[PDB]
Ligand binder design. Structure first.
Ligand code: ATP
Ligand code: ATP
Ligand code: ATP
Ligand code: ATP
Lengths: 282, 282, 282, 282
């Protein structure tokens, strides 16, 4: 794994095995990294953006590719993780947070440029804490006698969800499935959510000062078909002895969005197996 | 005990011995933990919610299962307890309360992931004090090189009682007992009480930002039958020499709710034995 | 013995008689020395490394081969032993410790190049005390008009145990025994423990500046089968009159690791016979 | 005596004559040494641990067996004694204390391996002063061309008393005597007191790094029956002319623990005879 440059087959295989729907994410991720990781000269690190609705698999997919790259998954000493609240709660110690940030970066990357960093809960940040990293995302071949363009920086959020929602019902109201929705959607309004001078969108506004991001990538509500997928596949994978009635109860005993149609889920495949344990309790 | 994974028989036995009514709680608890504790891969810690009326046995049942798991019950070094007021009175020292919180957590859990935490008196809290724990309730296999998904976090309150009351008289007014009331009841209005921007419900509103809770579980007023149960069973268990007249006085000398029906208790089995000591005084 | 070059049969015989499990150690040791001792031109002394969990037989196996080589075992004037604490407690007298070290070396080896040195308790050392011996582990045919490449230097520790543990439950969690685990395991993480700038791992970091070590060799927790082996074999060897119930009490009256599975021992065959004397006391 | 290997009869006889209660200690000691002293190959010295409450006979029993082994008792040149405070007061001269320790050891043991050492007042020690002796408690057949595995090292303390107390009232509250309490009791919590990073328990924490101890052995409060035993037996042994009223005054004129039950003694048979001299004064 760690001694394997990821071939396309392994990743399309993995996602097609476990990922439900999200054709966009398979296309994007597969071709994007498969070009990137095979490139000995990326010219830049990987600046990925994610937002939308939960339980669609953000930390899921990040975990998966983390496992395919390194056996450590998240256990790898290379793969070192940060969080907003656990590390960076307050606007008091912003400077310490910046210095500690820069140094912990230089440590892990100076171990190897193929190390990976991820952030999470980015609705609770303070733009000084981007002001210490934009130079690291210059396409410069180096900084301080070190190159960073092999590493890969990945973000997470949920803002801008309202656009992917009302668009989802837009085309779906057109007698259509999001398979037929294309990858291109209104990246202008995404730029607004990302220009949105709310601290969530203001953070990424000052980051998008130069589109240091590579690719905006929203996920979508795992439709009740996906519920049934992560009910059948999971409970049959767990020796759970599920049957049909339990999968009548996916929709007989769940709330979807909006009420007036009862379509878009509230969790997808996040709270699915707990409620399925109720359906063991039946 | 501590070297015993709890079999179903032991727990249904215990609850059927000592717990009066609360069929819902026996079903929920028994199957829920019995699936959870036997699961070597829970994918998440146990995020339990409780609210409703007192004296129905919240701290009672938590105590019981604490004893069945570990001989320490609450004496266990693993089982380390926090309280709102005793530890976290003021909105002044919120930050210290968060840091001390995180560290005391990491201590006990780093002793073992099967440690247990409980909170109480959650009507007196401040949402910063959830903002330090939501990452711990990611389904992440780890944080900071440590996994938390085996541990079990349990909360307590009494808000939202009005719904379980007016529903209780709803179906009971229908010529019916809450045995015939099903577990499913209006979890939407429960979400409102849990969305209720009152600090009690606002706390759990920002927690229910992702339904990090597993199962909402209300208790109900221990009906005067339950009084008579925890009068006969207790006083016969205590060598008290109770007789019939003392159990005429359970209702001849007590207030129930509402007045116009005199049905729902005020304490259930909490103040029962003190008033029974009056009936020794007769 | 001392006039015997160790044939393979004698050593595989001895280990297969007395050593329980540790297939890796039989393979490694047997072929390694059997090639080494029979080699009139080793090109280097034997640079052995050991770490892991106790009571698996480090000082046991070193004792055994010491006996097979020379009748003295440890009594041999050739076989002269050093210890961290007994000889080299403080960082004050480091220089005296280095000079005395070099001279005591030159004495014993100048008696014969087939002399043996062992160290122990290597978590309490100071890198100056390797800085006097790395030249002795050049593959040079000589130093100061003397050759050292026939002698054999052996170390001991317990650091890096966490890796052999979590790996042991890794493959064992895979429905598997460590017989099916191969000798190859993650020698990268072993290099980290051996790069671990802790003084224990920093010592061996500056030693592994050139991999002057030959073979990393961890031992593993002597599984409760091995307990029962060194209960039956020992007590039947001691005329102890053991029976079945005493070997019910190996697990009825012992702690294993983790609690949640009760698998990996705490001592293996170290404290076994004392507790068995309790089972005489029964 | 010194030319006598202790037969079982002599020791069970002696303890059954003079020792009051402490069935556990008779079983442990008798079988343990009787197997040990008769063993020509112990494989280790005797690593005994003692803690609990005073006046139950620690220095008493150590004295007794010291007398049975050698006529010198404590007068023997073989039996050479150390104390924390008298010899090892300060953390200033720790090194001198270690060197003097090692040398005085080597002296007495080189006189004979059947020499005995005891320590006392071990709540006032400094872990450097174990760091010089753990090698002596390797099961090695020798060190420095000398074997130590015949000698016997014995410790004393009073920490961890709280566990033997609250357990004593646990089973005693169960309608029961500690005769019916078994030898097995919560050796986990004993390990905590012995892991207790207090210097008293931290000392023995770094010793229990390898369970170099053989057997944990607590004593218990000599119950008022034992008072009356060491009142009748002693005063009748002393020609004191005791009568009944004096043994009404054992409890009419003494404090026990807790107040609310007045059960567990404060001294047992330590201050007993002085207060009995008051009852001569009556
Ligand atoms: N598309 C999917 N197919 C199958 N299972 C999924 C899918 N998406 C999510 N899950 C499951 O749901 C759970 C939640 O996934 P994950 O945490 O990655 O979503 P998320 O967007 O990271 O949530 P949040 O945004 O709150 O961090 C996981 O346990 C995962 O296995
Ligand atoms: N269902 C029941 N059957 C028998 N006894 C009960 C029951 N419920 C409560 N009791 C008794 O009533 C007392 C109160 O129980 P408990 O404190 O668990 O209720 P609670 O909901 O925790 O109260 P609060 O909400 O005020 O903390 C206990 O002493 C318990 O033994
Ligand atoms: N695999 C085994 N089979 C049988 N007996 C064993 C085995 N391993 C250890 N023992 C016994 O356990 C005791 C401890 O062995 P030994 O001291 O060699 O372990 P160790 O790793 O050297 O301990 P430490 O690391 O603390 O020095 C010895 O008396 C030995 O006979
Ligand atoms: N079980 C017993 N039966 C009869 N006499 C006893 C018993 N235990 C103690 N004594 C008497 O009480 C006195 C105190 O005994 P001893 O000093 O051995 O207790 P200790 O635990 O060593 O005290 P400390 O812990 O303070 O050193 C002695 O004089 C002894 O004779």
């Amino acid at each position: 794994g760690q001694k394997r440059s990821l071939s396309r087959e392994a990743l399309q295989k993995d996602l097609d095995d476990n990922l439900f729907g999200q054709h966009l994410a398979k296309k994007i991720i597969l071709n994007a990294v498969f070009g990137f990781i095979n490139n000995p000269k990326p010219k830049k690190p990987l600046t990925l953006s994610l937002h939308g609705w939960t339980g669609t698999g953000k930390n899921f997919v990040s975990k998966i590719i983390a496992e395919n790259i390194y056996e450590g998954g998240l256990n790898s000493d290379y793969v070192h993780l940060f969080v907003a609240t656990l590390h960076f709660p307050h606007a008091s110690n912003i400077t310490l947070y910046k210095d500690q940030l820069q140094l912990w970066i230089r440590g892990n990357v100076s171990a190897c440029a193929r190390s990976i960093f991820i952030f999470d809960e980015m609705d609770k940040m303070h733009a000084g804490l981007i002001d210490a990293i934009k130079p690291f995302l210059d396409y410069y071949d180096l900084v301080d006698g070190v190159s960073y363009q092999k590493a890969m920086f990945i973000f997470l959020s949920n803002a801008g969800a309202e656009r992917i929602t009302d668009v989802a019902l837009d085309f779906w109201r057109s007698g259509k499935q999001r398979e037929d929705i294309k990858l291109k959607d209104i990246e202008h309004a995404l730029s607004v959510s990302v220009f949105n001078n709310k601290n969530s969108g203001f953070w990424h506004s000052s980051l998008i000062d130069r589109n240091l991001i590579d690719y905006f990538v929203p996920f979508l509500p795992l439709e009740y078909k996906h519920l049934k997928m992560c009910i059948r596949v999971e409970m049959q994978s767990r020796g759970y002895e599920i049957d049909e009635d339990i999968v009548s109860r996916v929709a007989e005993e769940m709330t979807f969005f909006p009420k007036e149609e009862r379509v878009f889920s509230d969790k997808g495949c996040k709270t699915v197996f707990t409620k399925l344990d109720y359906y063991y309790d039946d």
